[PDB]
Design a protein around this ligand. Structure first.
Ligand SMILES: [Co+2]
Ligand SMILES: [Co+2]
Lengths: 238, 246
């Protein structure tokens, strides 16, 4: 966000769970973010399901998604996960991380048009067989800020629609917009990535966060939520 | 639309607690509603804090509220509730039910423009007389449950005489519980207590997004004792739970 600061005490939470990752946190009025690893904060990883955010905005922007009330009806073919084998709203599709739904959105937007929006959005970047899209935590928090401030190259309507769909928790005092990613299990040599991106609105303040971690045990996935919670709890947030 | 339908069956929980109230419930796809009392459903009551919903939209439309990231700054003047003595966002001012913040908005909106948008929303009997900004809590403005539900349907579907973006802002301001399987939008209302013949009213109005479906509700009850209040939340819940919603 301009200047990024190291908070090495955060690493205690990671080390207690034997997890290699990075948490990035930004207070909105600060225009400067904090982290546990300076080098890993700006390091680019596959967005996985977190890509469903810029996906949903382009999908609306192109008219591929007509409006917020559009249902994505199940065609009949057996999908990879059971949770996906039902009709879905926009929030439904996002929260169950229904890949096929967004694959179909991605097809009828197009590879070139998608790329045009990703450029404008400044969402991650590309790299001679393919070169998959990767994104840095620093880029996530920058991304979500522009989404929150309504400052993306999209209508405010379309940004607002996606934001409600990103609502994951709600209490009288705070509102949590978040999205999870998981690229798959990996090895110790070559690990998968787990994401949690979002922001926490509390009081008159806003905190943007991007967390990622190496994952080589199925069982450690839920840690993508406890590490960022325990840090934000002791920071004095939630 | 479709219809409303008395179902005395729900009265169970009301008798259970000696509560004179009404629930309206409406399946959106079915385009139809269901209640315990057709008579009380159409009976118009003081909106109280449920009135913040319209006031938010009128405030956004009129430019009074600049946008969703507007901060309503606390001057340092004492307020009736500890919870109001802090700076507030839109969601904040709606959640803690901050009377003075919204009273300020009503006054910057004016009687004229408050009539304008309230006419356009078909909000209640639309009658705002008496006091420039008291019409919600202890004024002349009154609204039915069915009307609440009607209004809230128009909000969900962005059908109001107000821009979509302002409609979406307030819709987010109303999120009160989020789960993977469903989302919840509501406001509470509460006019006061006691009798001297005439008892107070207590509202809970919202809608629930469950899978592909969505259920609109408005609820009110008669309150003469302060304690039976949480039943404004719990009773409508218990019924939705039985009907299989949450
Ligand atoms: Co928000
Ligand atoms: Co909603």
């Amino acid at each position: 966000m301009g200047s990024i600061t190291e908070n090495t005490s955060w690493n205690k939470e990671f080390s207690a769970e034997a997890v290699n990752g990075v948490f990035v946190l930004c207070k909105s009025s600060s225009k400067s973010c904090a982290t546990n690893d300076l080098a890993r904060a700006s390091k680019e990883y596959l967005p996985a399901s977190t890509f469903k955010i810029p996906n949903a905005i382009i999908g609306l922007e192109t008219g591929v998604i007509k409006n917020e009330h559009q249902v994505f009806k199940w065609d009949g073919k057996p999908r990879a996960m059971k949770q996906w084998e039902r009709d879905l709203t926009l929030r439904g599709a996002i929260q169950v991380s229904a890949v096929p739904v967004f694959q179909q959105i991605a097809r009828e937007v197009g590879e070139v048009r998608m790329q045009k929006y990703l450029k404008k959005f400044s969402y991650g970047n590309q790299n001679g067989l393919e070169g998959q899209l990767r994104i840095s935590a620093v880029n996530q928090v920058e991304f979500l800020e522009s989404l929150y401030l309504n400052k993306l190259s999209a209508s405010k309507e379309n940004q607002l629609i996606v934001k409600e769909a990103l609502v994951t928790e709600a209490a009288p005092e705070y509102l949590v917009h978040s999205k999870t990613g998981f690229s798959g299990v990996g090895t110790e040599s070559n690990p998968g990535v787990a994401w949690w991106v979002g922001w926490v609105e509390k009081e008159t303040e806003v905190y943007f966060f991007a967390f990622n971690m190496d994952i080589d045990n199925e069982s450690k996935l839920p840690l993508r939520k406890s590490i960022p919670t325990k840090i934000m709890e002791s920071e004095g947030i939630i």
